[PDB]
Amino acid sequence: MTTQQLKEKISKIIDNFSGIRVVFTTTANELKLSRIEGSALNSIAEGFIDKIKEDIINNEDLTSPLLSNFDDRKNALFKFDYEQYPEEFNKITQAIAIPPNSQDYYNPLNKFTDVKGIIILISGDNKCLALYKNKTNLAVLRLKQLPNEILRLDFNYDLFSIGEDFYIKNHKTLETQMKFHQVIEAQAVIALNSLRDSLLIEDISGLEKSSREISFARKLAKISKHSPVLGKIDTKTIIDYVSQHKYLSAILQINEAGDKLLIKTKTSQKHFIKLMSDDYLQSDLTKIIYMSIAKDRLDE
Amino acid sequence: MTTQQLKEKISKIIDNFSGIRVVFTTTANELKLSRIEGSALNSIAEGFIDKIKEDIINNEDLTSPLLSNFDDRKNALFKFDYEQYPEEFNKITQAIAIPPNSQDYYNPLNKFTDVKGIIILISGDNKCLALYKNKTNLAVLRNSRPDGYLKQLPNEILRLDFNYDLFSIGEDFYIKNHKTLETQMKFHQVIEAQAVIALNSLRDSLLIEDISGLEKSSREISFARKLAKISKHSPVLGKIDTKTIIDYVSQHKYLSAILQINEAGDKLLIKTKTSQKHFIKLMSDDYLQSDLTKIIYMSIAKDRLDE
Secondary structure (H helix, E strand, O other): OOHHHHHHHHHHHHHOEEEEEEEEEEOOOOEEEOOEOHHHHHHHHHHHHHHHHHHHHOOOOOOOOEOOOOOOEOOOOEEOOOOOOOHHHHHHHHHHOOOOOOOOEOOHHHOOOOEEEEEEEEEEOOEEEEEEEEOOOOOEEOOOOOOOOOEEOOOOOOEEEEOOEEEEOOOOHHHHHOHHHOHHHHHHHHHHHHHHOOOOEOOOHHHHHHOOOHHHHHHHHHHHHOOOOOOOOOHHHHHHHHHHOOOOOOOOEEOOOOOOEEOOOHHHHHHHHHHHOOOEEEOOOOOOEEEEEEEEEOOO | OOHHHHHHHHHHHHHOEEEEEEEEEOOOOOEEEOOOOHHHHHHHHOOOHHHHHHHHHOOOOOEOOEOOOOOOEOOEOEEOOOOOOOHHHHHHHHHHOOOOOOOOEOOHHHOOOOOOEEEEEEEEOOEEEEEEEEOOOOOOEEEOOOOOOEEEOOOOOEEOOOOOOEOOOOOOOEEOOHHHHHHHOOOHHHHHHHHHHHHHHHHHHOOEOOOHHHHHHOOOHHHHHHHHHHHHHOOOEOOEOHHHHHHHHHHOOOHHHHOEEOOOOOOEEOOOHHHHHHHHHHHOOOEEEEOOOOOEEEEEEEEEOOO
16 A cells, blocks of 8 residues: 555545544553543644645655665655554554544543553544554743643654554654564564574674664664565675675675675674665666665566 | 764763753844753753764764755754855854853743744853754643643743754754754755756756756755755766766666657656656666666665765
């Protein structure tokens, strides 16, 4: 369900707007219903529709790839391609379908320390577009500070769900608030056994020590599910490419035998990770080598 | 002044922290000294590394390309390389240099509607890091009044924390959030003037037959920021002849279908937004093939290696 079909599906909801209503997921994993004043609930709907338009609709360079094929792209809304739904994904699913006559309302004596996340439900063309912002008290002034409880809606979303297909804006909320996306740590070490069974690296320990920092653990799961080099082109062709390469030879070294790579230092680990993401590309026009941070296939 | 040279210019100010001073800028373009509470000032100080280390120091995938070589990279600090300082750059330059004995303090009867931006001066190692932020319209400060509803009671409370917008480490400034620069500081005059230079150079290049579709997209700063990039950092315009690009597109496996050549053979056909966006990506050399896997790729964010 492509970038354009998203732009159709969202602008169907935005133009034939039917109703907004806000749900609190709490620490007890129950969806409690808000009591927002009308001109303040009109205050929520106007600015979200602009942010929805700014991020999706008339946004030209919107890019929707798979979450396992993560990289560092601005704008962009990542497709949830995994199968393990964190429980808050399913809480948003039940948040879509509270009946409108229900009275399980949020009691405001709880001082918004119960509020774990804020669910914005924007409905239109009979469907509903749910958005998610985690409870972020942040900081407000007046000079002194008195709230420490007062709710905050910064018109911003991390997670949103159109139908049965979830999309990702801020990747960090999907880990540090959602299960550390612990599939990633397991997907990183399935790749570490696959690098072990590739026998391309001599010592696998420095790669095993980068799997603690989650900034490398995403890059391992990228190569685990989406590599065009691991398991597809053989070991000796990779080594002969790196040796003949102009930039890659000075950093990655091959052992005395010539059959195993020497990836021990962090400077060599970052570049070898960018080797198995195929991020060392060349133009047929300018004949210049390049280092890709964000890229996409073309013949599909 | 590279990425690592930014990283240790910051962690020199960071690991020898001296004092944090908060300056409000007005709509009268006069700087105003805040009155931050002491336990608030420590909670406002927050470390700030808690944001700054995660953007700079501990951030391994930190990238510092020029602002004029814009692309869509996250965890990225765009080095300001233009000649023109928008007036808040010059107000941040004076924001560093208020003497600490000065009594030009901010009067809080203004209800924070004169407040246009928020300057976080973070000083250390006798230098000063300065952060910039805009006063946005309070987001929503919804509070209670059992039967309790919710309402934006004050509608004047200053809402501020991290997610900074603009640097001032030395004179080489950096941009994290670029929309702040183009809209609140009014930088989009300089991008659109640079983009019109690009349209006249393509007109002189004679690679396209009609240029009107590029000029209808030139108002949207999305195309103008890609036109201002190609005006200043393309490895194709003027360096290679127009015919060689045409035989390369005519030979191509993807570009041959979208971008066409006229019936004569010397001019490219760029009219619809599809053929504009793909020729824009052709122009900044974003179509690259692997020397290993031999798969053609379309790059969003890239970097040279030879330099």
